Structures are given as structure tokens and as C-alpha cells.
Short mmCIF file of C-alpha atoms in Angstrom, two decimals:
data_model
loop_
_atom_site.label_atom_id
_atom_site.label_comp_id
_atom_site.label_asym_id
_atom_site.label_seq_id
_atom_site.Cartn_x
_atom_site.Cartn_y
_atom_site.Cartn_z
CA UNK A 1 2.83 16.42 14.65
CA UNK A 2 4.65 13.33 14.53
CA UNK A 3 6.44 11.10 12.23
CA UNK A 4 4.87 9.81 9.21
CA UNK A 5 7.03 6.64 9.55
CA UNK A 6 6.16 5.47 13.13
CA UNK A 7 3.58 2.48 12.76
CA UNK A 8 2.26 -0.80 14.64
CA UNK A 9 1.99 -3.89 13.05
CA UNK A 10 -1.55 -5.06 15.08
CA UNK A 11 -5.02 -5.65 14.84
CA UNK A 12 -6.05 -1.84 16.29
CA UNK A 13 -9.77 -2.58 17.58
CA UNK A 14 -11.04 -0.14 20.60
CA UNK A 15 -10.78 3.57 19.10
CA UNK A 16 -9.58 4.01 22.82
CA UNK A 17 -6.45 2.46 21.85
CA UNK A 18 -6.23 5.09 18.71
CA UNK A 19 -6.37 7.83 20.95
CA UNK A 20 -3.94 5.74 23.11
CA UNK A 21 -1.26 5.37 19.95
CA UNK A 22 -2.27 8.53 17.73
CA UNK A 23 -0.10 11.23 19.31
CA UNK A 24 2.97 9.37 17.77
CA UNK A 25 1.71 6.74 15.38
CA UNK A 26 1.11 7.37 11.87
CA UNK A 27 -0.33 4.05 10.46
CA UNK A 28 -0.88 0.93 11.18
CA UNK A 29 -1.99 -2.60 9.21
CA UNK A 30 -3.53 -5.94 10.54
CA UNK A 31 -1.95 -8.64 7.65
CA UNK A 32 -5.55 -8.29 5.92
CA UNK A 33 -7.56 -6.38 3.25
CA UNK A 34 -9.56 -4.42 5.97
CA UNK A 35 -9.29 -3.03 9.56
CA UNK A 36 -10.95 -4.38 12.58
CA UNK A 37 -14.79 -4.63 11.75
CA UNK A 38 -15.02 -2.81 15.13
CA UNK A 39 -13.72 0.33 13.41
CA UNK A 40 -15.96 0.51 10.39
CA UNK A 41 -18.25 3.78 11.36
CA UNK A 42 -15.29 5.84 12.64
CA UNK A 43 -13.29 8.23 10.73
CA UNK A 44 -10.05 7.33 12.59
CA UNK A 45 -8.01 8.88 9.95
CA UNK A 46 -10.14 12.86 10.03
CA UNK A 47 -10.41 12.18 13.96
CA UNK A 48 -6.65 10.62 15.10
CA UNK A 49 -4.88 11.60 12.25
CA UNK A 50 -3.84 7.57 11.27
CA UNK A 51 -4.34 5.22 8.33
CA UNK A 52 -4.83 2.07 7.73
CA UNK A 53 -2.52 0.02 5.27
CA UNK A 54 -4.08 -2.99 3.74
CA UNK A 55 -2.06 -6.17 2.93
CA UNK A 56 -2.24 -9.45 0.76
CA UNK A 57 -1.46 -12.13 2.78
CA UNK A 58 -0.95 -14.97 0.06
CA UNK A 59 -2.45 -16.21 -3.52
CA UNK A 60 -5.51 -16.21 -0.91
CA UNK A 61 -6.98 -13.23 -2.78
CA UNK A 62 -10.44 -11.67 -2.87
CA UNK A 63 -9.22 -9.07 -6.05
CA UNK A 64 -12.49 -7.78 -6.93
CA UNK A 65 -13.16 -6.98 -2.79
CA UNK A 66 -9.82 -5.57 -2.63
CA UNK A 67 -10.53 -3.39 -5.48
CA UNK A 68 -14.01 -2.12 -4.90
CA UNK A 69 -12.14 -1.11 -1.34
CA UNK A 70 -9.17 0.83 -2.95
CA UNK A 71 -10.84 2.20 -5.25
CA UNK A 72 -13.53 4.17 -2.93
CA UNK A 73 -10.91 4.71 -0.47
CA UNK A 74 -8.16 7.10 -2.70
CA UNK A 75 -6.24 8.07 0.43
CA UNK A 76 -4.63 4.37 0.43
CA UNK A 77 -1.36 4.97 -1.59
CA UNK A 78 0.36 1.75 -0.52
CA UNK A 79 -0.64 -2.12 -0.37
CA UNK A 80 1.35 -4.27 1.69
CA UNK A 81 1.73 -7.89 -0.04
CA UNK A 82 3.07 -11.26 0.79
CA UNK A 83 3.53 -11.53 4.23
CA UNK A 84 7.08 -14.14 4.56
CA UNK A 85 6.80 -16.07 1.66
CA UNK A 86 9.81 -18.05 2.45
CA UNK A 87 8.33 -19.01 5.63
CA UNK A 88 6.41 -22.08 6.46
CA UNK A 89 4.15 -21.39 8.99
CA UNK A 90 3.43 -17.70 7.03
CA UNK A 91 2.66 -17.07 3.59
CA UNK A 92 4.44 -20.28 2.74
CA UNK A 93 4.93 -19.36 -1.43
CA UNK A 94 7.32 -20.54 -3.56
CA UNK A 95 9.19 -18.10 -5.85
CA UNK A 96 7.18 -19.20 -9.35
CA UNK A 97 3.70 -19.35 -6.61
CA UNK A 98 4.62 -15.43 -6.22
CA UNK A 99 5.38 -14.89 -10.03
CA UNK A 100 2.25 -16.31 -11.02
CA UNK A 101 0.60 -14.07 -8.35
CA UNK A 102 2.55 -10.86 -9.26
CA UNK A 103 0.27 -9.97 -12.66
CA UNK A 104 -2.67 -9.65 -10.40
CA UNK A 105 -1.15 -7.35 -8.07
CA UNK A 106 0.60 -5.55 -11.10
CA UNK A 107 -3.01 -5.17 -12.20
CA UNK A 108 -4.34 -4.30 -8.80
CA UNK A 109 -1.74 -1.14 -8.81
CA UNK A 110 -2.75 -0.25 -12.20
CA UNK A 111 -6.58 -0.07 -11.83
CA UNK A 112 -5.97 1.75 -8.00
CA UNK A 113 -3.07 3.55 -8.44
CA UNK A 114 -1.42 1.77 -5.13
CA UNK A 115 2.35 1.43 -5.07
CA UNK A 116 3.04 -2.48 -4.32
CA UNK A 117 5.08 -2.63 -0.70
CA UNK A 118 6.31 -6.55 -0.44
CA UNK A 119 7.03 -9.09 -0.78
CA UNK A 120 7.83 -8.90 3.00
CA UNK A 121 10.81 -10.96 3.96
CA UNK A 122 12.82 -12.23 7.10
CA UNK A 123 15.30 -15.54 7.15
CA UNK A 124 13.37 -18.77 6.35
CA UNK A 125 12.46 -21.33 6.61
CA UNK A 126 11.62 -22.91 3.15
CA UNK A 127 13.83 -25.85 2.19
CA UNK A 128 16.38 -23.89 -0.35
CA UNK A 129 14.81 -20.42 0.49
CA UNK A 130 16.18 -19.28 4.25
CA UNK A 131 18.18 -16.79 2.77
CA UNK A 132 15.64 -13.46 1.22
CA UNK A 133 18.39 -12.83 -1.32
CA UNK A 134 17.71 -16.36 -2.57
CA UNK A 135 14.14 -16.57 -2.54
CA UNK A 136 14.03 -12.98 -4.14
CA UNK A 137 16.77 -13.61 -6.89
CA UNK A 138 14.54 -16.64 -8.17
CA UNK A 139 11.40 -14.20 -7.45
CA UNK A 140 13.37 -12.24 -10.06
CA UNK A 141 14.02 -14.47 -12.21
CA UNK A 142 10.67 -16.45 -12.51
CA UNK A 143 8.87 -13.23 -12.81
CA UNK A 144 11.45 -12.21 -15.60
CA UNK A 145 10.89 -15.06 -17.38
CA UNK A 146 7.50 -15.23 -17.60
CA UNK A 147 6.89 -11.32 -19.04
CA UNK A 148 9.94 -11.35 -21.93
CA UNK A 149 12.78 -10.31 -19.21
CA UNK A 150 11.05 -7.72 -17.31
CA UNK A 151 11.51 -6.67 -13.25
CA UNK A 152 8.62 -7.55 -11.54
CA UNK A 153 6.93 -4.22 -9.90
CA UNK A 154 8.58 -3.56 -6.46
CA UNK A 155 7.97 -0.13 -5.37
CA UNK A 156 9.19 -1.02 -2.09
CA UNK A 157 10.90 -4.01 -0.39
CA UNK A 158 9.44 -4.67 2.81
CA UNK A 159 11.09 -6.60 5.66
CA UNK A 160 10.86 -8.31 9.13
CA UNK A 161 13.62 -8.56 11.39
CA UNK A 162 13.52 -9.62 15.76
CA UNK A 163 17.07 -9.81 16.09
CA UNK A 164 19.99 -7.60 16.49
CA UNK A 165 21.83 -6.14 13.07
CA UNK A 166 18.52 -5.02 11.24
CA UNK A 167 20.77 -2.25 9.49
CA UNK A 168 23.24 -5.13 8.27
CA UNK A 169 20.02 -7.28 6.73
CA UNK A 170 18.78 -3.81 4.93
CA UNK A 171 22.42 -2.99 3.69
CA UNK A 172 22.19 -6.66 2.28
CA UNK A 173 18.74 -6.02 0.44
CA UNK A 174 19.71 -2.70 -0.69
CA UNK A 175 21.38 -5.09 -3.77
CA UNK A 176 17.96 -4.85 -5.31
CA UNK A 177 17.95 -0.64 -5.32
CA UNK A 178 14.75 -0.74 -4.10
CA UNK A 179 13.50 1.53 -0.42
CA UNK A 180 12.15 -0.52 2.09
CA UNK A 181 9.37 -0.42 4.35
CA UNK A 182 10.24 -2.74 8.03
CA UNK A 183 6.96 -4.06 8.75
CA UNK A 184 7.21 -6.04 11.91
CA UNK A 185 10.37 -5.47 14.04
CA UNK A 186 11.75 -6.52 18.20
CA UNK A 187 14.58 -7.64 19.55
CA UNK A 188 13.67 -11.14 20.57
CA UNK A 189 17.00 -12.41 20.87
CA UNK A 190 17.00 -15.11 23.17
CA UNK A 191 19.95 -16.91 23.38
CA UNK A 192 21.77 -16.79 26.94
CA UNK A 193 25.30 -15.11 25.14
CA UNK A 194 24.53 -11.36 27.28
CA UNK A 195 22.77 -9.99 24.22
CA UNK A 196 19.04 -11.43 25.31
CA UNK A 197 16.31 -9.16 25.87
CA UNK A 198 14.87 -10.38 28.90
CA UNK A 199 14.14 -6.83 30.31
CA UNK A 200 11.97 -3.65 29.57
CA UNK A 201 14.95 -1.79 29.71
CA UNK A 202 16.93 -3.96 27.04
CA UNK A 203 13.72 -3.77 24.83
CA UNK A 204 13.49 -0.27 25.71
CA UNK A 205 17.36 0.25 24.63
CA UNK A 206 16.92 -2.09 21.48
CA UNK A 207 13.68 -0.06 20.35
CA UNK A 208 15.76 3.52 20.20
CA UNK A 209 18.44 1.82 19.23
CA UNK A 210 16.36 0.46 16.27
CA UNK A 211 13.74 3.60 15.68
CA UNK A 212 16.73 6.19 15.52
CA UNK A 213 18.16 3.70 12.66
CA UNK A 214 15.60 3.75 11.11
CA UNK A 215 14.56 7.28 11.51
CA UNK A 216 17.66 8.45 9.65
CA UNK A 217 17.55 5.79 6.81
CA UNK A 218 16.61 7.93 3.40
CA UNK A 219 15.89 4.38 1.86
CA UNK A 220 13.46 3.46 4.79
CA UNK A 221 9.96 5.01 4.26
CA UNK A 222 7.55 3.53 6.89
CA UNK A 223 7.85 0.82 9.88
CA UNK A 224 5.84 -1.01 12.75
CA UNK A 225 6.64 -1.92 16.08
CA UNK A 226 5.49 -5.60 16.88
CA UNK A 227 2.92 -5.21 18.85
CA UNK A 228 0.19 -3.93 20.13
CA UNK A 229 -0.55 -6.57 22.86
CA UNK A 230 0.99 -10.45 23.11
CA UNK A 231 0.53 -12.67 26.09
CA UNK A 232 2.83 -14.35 27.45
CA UNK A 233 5.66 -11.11 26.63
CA UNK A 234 8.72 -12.42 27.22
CA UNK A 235 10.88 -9.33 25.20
CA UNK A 236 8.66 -7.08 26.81
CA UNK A 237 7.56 -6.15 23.43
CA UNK A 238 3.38 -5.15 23.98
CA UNK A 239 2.69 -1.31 23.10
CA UNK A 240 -0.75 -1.48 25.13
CA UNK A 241 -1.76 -3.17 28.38
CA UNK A 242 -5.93 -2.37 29.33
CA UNK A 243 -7.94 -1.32 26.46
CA UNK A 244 -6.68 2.27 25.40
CA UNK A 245 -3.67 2.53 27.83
CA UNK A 246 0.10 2.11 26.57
CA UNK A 247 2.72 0.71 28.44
CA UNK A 248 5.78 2.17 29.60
CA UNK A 249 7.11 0.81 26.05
CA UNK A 250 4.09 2.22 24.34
CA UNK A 251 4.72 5.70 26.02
CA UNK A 252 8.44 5.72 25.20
CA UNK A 253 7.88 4.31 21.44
CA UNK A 254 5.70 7.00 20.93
CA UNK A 255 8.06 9.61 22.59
CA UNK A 256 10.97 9.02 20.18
CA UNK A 257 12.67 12.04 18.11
CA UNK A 258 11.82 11.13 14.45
CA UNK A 259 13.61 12.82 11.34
#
């Protein structure tokens, strides 16, 4: 038994690293339509007890694939889309690019039944668009004006955050009434101020800090840990060290109370 929020945001490949993260983790997603090809001929979710969350990335979009997937896989409830459009270096799309998108994910939910979890947002760095309340209230609006004043479909909000006040960024978002789902949080905060996390025991500290939060947020229905594994690890941030074996962080991450 464990909590159907806790997830990692990382390409899971070794089934020895399932049996590593299942006793605590629920679900997990790679930013793409599929898991690992690795995984393919295992039933992780009858063996571990975990799913796999597929996501649109961008416009980038393979809708036919994605549906023939969905379709013959009716446990998938949720599809993660639009991984930080109002970043550069990420999905990089405008707020009209992600209206014009929308209709096909709209369509994607209809024919599959999956509720639409996105688009998944963090402070940018899009000329004009830094701010997520910006780049979603023109989301809004270009959406709204290209269907005769109708709301977009958000089922859920979904949101990235490596700093401290994640609860002050989701009290900000909340203006939209919608639940959230935190895809990819850390603490990576770096400046030298005293608040850096340049220990395992500050990341440690941050990640209760952050999971109990989280926990006991009604409006927050699933998150991931980032990540699995990163070289060089400055935050001390990596769930996993040798293939199916956690870290200390990994251990304790999975070891948190949950509501």
C-alpha cells in the first residue's frame, strides 16, 4: 500500500529499478507517448503495482499512434501535455501555437476518454511569457476566441517548480479553479543567501518539506520527484544510483507518510 500520488518524473528502463521504486511509487512518465522500449513485454503495472502516464511534448504529435495506444490500453485515465510551453529550450509554444493544438487534444480525450493534465508550467523564459499566469491568460483567451468564447479543456493544471515556495506558485494558479498535478519538482536553489541545497540533508529536508505539502493539498492529485538518476548531482536530487538500487534519497522519498 502506498500513495497513489507519489511518482518520478524519469525514463524507468531496468524492471530492477521498478522493484527498486514500487514499494512507494505509484506512477511514473518519461515526457513521451510510450515507456522505455526496454519495458514493452512486462506487465509492470499486474507485477509492481505502477503505471505509466503518457505525455505530449509539443505540436510534435503522432495522434493516430497516440490513439491506437490509448485506446488498447483503458487503464490510462490521464495524458500529460505540453511540457513548459513558455520555455525556450522546452516545448517552446506560443499561446495561439497551443490553441491551435488544443482541438486535437480535445479530440484525443473524446475518442479515449483521457482527462487532459497540462499544459505544464514553471517561470519562463519566452519574451512576454515568464510569468504562467500570463502565458495561460492569453492560452485562455486565444483558445476562447477561436471556439465562440469557450474554456479550453483543462482537467488538471500541471506544474514544475525547483525552488523554494512551491505552495505560494500553486496558491497563485489556483486563480484558474482548476487541481493540479506537480510534475517535476527539487529544490535546486543555488544562490549562496543560506537557503542553497548543497547537501543530502537539505535535499532530504526540502523533499519532506515539499511531499508533506503536497500530500495534504485536496487540489493536488499526483506528483514526481525529479529524478531518477542525473550526473553531475549537485542538489543531491538522483532517486537511484546502480541499476535497481535507490539512494539514501530514493529510500527516504519512498518512506514518506502520504495522506
Amino acid at each position: 500500500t502506498k500513495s497513489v500520488k507519489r511518482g518520478v518524473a524519469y525514463d524507468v528502463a531496468s524492471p530492477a529499478d521498478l522493484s527498486a521504486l514500487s514499494t512507494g511509487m505509484s506512477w511514473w512518465y518519461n515526457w513521451s507517448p510510450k515507456p522505455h522500449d526496454r519495458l514493452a513485454a512486462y506487465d509492470y503495472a499486474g507485477q509492481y503495482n505502477v503505471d505509466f502516464v503518457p505525455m505530449v511534448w509539443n505540436a510534435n504529435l503522432d495522434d493516430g499512434q497516440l490513439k491506437l495506444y490509448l485506446l488498447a490500453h483503458p487503464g490510462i485515465r490521464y495524458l500529460l501535455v505540453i511540457n513548459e510551453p513558455n520555455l525556450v529550450d522546452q516545448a517552446n509554444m506560443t499561446p495561439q501555437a497551443a490553441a491551435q493544438l488544443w482541438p486535437r487534444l480535445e479530440q484525443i480525450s473524446a475518442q479515449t476518454g483521457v482527462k487532459l493534465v497540462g499544459p505544464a508550467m514553471n517561470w519562463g523564459t519566452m519574451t512576454g511569457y515568464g510569468d504562467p499566469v500570463a502565458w495561460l491568460d492569453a492560452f485562455y483567451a486565444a483558445y476562447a476566441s477561436a471556439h465562440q468564447g469557450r474554456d479550453p479543456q483543462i482537467d488538471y493544471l500541471a506544474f514544475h517548480w525547483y525552488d523554494y515556495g512551491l505552495s505560494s506558485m500553486l496558491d497563485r494558479l489556483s486563480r484558474y479553479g482548476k487541481p493540479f498535478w506537480v510534475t517535476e519538482f527539487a529544490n535546486w536553489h543555488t544562490l549562496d543567501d543560506g537557503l542553497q541545497i548543497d547537501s543530502l540533508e537539505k535535499q532530504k529536508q526540502q523533499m519532506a518539506e515539499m511531499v508533506t505539502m503536497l500530500e495534504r493539498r485536496s487540489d493536488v492529485f499526483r506528483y514526481a520527484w525529479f529524478t531518477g538518476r542525473m550526473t553531475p548531482d549537485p542538489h543531491f536530487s538522483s532517486l537511484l544510483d546502480a541499476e535497481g538500487r535507490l539512494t539514501e534519497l530514493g529510500q527516504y522519498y519512498l518512506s514518506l507518510p502520504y495522506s
